mmCIF file of C-alpha atoms in Angstrom:
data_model
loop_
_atom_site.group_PDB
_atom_site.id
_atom_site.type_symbol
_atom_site.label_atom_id
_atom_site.label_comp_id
_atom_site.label_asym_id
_atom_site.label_seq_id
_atom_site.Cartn_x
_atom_site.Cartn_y
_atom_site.Cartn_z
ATOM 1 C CA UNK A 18 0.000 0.000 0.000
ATOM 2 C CA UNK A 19 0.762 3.757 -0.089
ATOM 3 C CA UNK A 20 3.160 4.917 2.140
ATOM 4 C CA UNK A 21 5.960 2.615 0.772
ATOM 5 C CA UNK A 22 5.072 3.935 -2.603
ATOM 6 C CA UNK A 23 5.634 7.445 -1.577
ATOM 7 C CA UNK A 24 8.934 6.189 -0.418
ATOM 8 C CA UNK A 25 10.043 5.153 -3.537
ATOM 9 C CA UNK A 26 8.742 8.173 -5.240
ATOM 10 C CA UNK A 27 10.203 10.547 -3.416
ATOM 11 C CA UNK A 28 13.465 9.117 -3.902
ATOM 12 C CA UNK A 29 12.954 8.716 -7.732
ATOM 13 C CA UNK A 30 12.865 12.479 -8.432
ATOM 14 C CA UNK A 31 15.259 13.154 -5.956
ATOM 15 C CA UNK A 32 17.737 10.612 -8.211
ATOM 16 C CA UNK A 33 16.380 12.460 -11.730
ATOM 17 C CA UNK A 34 16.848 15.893 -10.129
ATOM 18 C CA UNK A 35 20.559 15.135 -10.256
ATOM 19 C CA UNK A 36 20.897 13.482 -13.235
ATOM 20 C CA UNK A 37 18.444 13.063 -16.248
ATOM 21 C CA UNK A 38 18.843 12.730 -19.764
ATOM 22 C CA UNK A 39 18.725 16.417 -21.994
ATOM 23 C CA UNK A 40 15.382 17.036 -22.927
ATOM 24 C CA UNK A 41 13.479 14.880 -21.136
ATOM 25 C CA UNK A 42 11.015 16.411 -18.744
ATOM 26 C CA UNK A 43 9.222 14.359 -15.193
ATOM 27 C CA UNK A 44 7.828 16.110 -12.599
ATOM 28 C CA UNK A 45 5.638 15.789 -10.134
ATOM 29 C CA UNK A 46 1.626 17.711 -10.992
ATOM 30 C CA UNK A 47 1.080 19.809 -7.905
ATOM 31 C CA UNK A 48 -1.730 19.350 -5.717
ATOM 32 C CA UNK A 49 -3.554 22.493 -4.692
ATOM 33 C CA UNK A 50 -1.821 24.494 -2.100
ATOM 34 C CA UNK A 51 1.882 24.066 -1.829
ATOM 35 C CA UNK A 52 0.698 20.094 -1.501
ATOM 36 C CA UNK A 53 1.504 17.504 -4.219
ATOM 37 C CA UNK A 54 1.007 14.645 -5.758
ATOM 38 C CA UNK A 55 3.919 12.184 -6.388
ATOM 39 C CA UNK A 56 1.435 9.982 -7.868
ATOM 40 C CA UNK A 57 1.074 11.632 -10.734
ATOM 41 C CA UNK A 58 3.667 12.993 -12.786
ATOM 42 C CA UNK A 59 3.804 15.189 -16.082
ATOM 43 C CA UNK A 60 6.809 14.440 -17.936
ATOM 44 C CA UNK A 61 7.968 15.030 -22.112
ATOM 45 C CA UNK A 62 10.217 12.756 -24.410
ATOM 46 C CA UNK A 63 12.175 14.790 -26.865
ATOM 47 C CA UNK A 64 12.150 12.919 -30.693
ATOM 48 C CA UNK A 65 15.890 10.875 -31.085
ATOM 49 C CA UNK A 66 18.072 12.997 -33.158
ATOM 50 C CA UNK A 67 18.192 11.367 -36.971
ATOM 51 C CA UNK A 68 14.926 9.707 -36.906
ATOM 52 C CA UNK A 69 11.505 11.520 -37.897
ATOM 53 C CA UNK A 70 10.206 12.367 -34.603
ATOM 54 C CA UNK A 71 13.254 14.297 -33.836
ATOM 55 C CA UNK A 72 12.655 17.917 -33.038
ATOM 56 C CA UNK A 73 9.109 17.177 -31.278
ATOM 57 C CA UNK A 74 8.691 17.453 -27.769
ATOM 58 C CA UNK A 75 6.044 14.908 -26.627
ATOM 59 C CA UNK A 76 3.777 15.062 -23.529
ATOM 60 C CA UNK A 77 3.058 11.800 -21.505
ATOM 61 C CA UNK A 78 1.552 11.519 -17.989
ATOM 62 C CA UNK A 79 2.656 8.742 -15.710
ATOM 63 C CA UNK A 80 0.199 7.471 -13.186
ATOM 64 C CA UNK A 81 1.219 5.259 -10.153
ATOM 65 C CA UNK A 82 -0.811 2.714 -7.453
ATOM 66 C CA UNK A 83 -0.681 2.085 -3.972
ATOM 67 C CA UNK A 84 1.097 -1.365 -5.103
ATOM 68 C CA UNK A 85 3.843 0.908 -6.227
ATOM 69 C CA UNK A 86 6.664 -0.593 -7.012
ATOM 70 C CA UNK A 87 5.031 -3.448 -6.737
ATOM 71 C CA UNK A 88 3.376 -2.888 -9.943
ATOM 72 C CA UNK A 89 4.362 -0.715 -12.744
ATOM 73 C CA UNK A 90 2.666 2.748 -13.721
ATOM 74 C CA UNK A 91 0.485 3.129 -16.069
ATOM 75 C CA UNK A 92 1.849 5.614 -18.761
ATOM 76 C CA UNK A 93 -0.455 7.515 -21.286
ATOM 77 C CA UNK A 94 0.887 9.939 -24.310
ATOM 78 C CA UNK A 95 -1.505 12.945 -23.892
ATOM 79 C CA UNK A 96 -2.622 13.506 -26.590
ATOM 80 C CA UNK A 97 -2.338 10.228 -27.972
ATOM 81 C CA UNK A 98 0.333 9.650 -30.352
ATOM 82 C CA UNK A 99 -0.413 7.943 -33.642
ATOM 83 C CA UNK A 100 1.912 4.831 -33.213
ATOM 84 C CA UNK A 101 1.591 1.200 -32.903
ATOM 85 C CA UNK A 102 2.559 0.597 -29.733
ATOM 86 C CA UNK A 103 -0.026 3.461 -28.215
ATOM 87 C CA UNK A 104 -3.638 2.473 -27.862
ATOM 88 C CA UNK A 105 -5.895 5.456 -28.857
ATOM 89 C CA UNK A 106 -6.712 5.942 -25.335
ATOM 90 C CA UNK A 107 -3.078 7.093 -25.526
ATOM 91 C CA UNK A 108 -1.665 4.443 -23.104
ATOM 92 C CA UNK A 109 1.632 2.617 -23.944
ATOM 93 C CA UNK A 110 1.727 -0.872 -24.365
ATOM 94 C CA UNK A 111 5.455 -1.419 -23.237
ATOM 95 C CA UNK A 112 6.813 -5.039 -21.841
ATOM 96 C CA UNK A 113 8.248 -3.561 -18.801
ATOM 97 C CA UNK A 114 5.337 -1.665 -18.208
ATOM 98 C CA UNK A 115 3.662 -5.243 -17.747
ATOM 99 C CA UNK A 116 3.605 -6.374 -14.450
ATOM 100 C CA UNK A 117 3.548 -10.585 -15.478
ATOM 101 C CA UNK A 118 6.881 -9.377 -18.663
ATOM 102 C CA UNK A 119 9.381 -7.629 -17.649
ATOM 103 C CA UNK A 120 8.528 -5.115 -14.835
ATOM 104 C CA UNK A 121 10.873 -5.147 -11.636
ATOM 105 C CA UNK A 122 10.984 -2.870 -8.674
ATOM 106 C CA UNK A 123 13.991 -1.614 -9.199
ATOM 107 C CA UNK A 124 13.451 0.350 -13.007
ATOM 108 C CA UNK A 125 13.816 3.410 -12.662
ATOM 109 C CA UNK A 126 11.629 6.713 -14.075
ATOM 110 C CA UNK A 127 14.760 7.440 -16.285
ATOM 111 C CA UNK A 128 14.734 3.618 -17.538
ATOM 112 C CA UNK A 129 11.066 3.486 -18.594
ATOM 113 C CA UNK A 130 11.408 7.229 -19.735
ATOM 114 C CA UNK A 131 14.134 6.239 -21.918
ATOM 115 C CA UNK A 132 12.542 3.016 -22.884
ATOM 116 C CA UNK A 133 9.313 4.703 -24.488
ATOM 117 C CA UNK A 134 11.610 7.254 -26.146
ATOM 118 C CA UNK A 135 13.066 4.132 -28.224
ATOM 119 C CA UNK A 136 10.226 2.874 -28.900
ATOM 120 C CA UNK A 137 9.009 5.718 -30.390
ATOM 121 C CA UNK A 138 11.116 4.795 -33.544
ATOM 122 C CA UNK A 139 11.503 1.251 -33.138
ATOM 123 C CA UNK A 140 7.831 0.073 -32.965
ATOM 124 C CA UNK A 141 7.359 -3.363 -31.850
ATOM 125 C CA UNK A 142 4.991 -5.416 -34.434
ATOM 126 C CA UNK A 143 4.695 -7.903 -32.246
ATOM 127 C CA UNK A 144 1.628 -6.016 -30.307
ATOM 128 C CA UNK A 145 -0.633 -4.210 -32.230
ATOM 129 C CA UNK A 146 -2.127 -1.590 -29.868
ATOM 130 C CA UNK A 147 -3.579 1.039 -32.557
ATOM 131 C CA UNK A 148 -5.095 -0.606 -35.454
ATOM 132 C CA UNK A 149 -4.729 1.841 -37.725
ATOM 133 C CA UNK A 150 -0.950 2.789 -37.445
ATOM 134 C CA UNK A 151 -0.206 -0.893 -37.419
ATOM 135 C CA UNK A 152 -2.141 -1.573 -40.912
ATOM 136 C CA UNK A 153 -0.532 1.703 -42.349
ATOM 137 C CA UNK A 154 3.053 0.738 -40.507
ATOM 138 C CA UNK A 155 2.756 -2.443 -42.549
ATOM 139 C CA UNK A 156 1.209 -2.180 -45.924
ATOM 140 C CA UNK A 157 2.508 1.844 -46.323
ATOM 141 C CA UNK A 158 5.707 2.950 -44.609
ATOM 142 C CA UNK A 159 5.570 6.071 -46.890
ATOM 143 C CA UNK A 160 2.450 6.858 -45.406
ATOM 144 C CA UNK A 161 3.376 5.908 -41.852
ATOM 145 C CA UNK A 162 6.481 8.197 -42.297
ATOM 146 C CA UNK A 163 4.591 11.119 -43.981
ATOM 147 C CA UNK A 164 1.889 10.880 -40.454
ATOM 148 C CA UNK A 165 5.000 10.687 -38.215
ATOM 149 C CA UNK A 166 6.886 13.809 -39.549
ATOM 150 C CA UNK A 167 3.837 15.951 -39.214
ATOM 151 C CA UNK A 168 3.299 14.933 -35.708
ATOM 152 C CA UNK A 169 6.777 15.669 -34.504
ATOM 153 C CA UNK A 170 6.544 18.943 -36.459
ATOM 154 C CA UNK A 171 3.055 19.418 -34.438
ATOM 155 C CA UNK A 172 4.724 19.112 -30.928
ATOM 156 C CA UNK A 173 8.201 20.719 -31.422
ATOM 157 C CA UNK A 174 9.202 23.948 -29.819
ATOM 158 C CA UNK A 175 7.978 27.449 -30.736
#
């Protein structure tokens, strides 16, 4: 239950605060009132440099449980992205993000962070969240990269 969850969390952005990746972005949303909620965190993956969704800057919440780290959070691209591995509810179907595959206490914000950004550009075939960029991803990879571009033009800087 809670408690030990806030545990953890508090460490993790105490760890990130002194060293994360360029460009990324996690923090914690603020309650009301000086408060705040650890359990809920707004945080951006920059595009990888040399790929198509380089230059956006993409927004993804990351929720988190009591069961914390017991089970992993639950990580949703708001807006929704248009990519395979996204459902169009925006969540991320990721195998460490899986509690049964390859979730473990120990990952760290930074390590699923990281993750999603590489799978950003490296979709994995293997499970088809969003219908429609996995048809397109398959039978059109023009198409697929012609969608892409526009959406990291759509969420870069300005």
């Amino acid at each position: 239950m809670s408690g030990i969850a806030l545990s953890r969390l508090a460490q993790e952005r105490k760890a990130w605060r002194k060293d994360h990746p360029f460009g990324f972005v996690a923090v914690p949303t603020k309650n009301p009132d000086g408060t705040m909620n650890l359990m809920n965190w707004e945080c951006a993956i920059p595009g990888k440099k040399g790929t198509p969704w380089e230059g956006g800057l993409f927004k993804l919440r990351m929720l988190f449980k009591d069961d914390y780290p017991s089970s992993p959070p639950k990580c949703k691209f708001e807006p929704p992205l248009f990519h395979p591995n996204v459902y169009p509810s925006g969540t991320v179907c990721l195998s460490i993000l899986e509690e049964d595959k390859d979730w473990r206490p120990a990952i760290t914000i930074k390590q699923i962070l990281l993750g999603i950004q590489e799978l950003l550009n490296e979709p994995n075939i293997q499970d088809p969240a969003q219908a429609e960029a996995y048809t397109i991803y398959c039978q059109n990879r023009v198409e697929y990269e012609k969608r892409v571009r526009a959406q990291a033009k759509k969420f870069a800087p300005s």
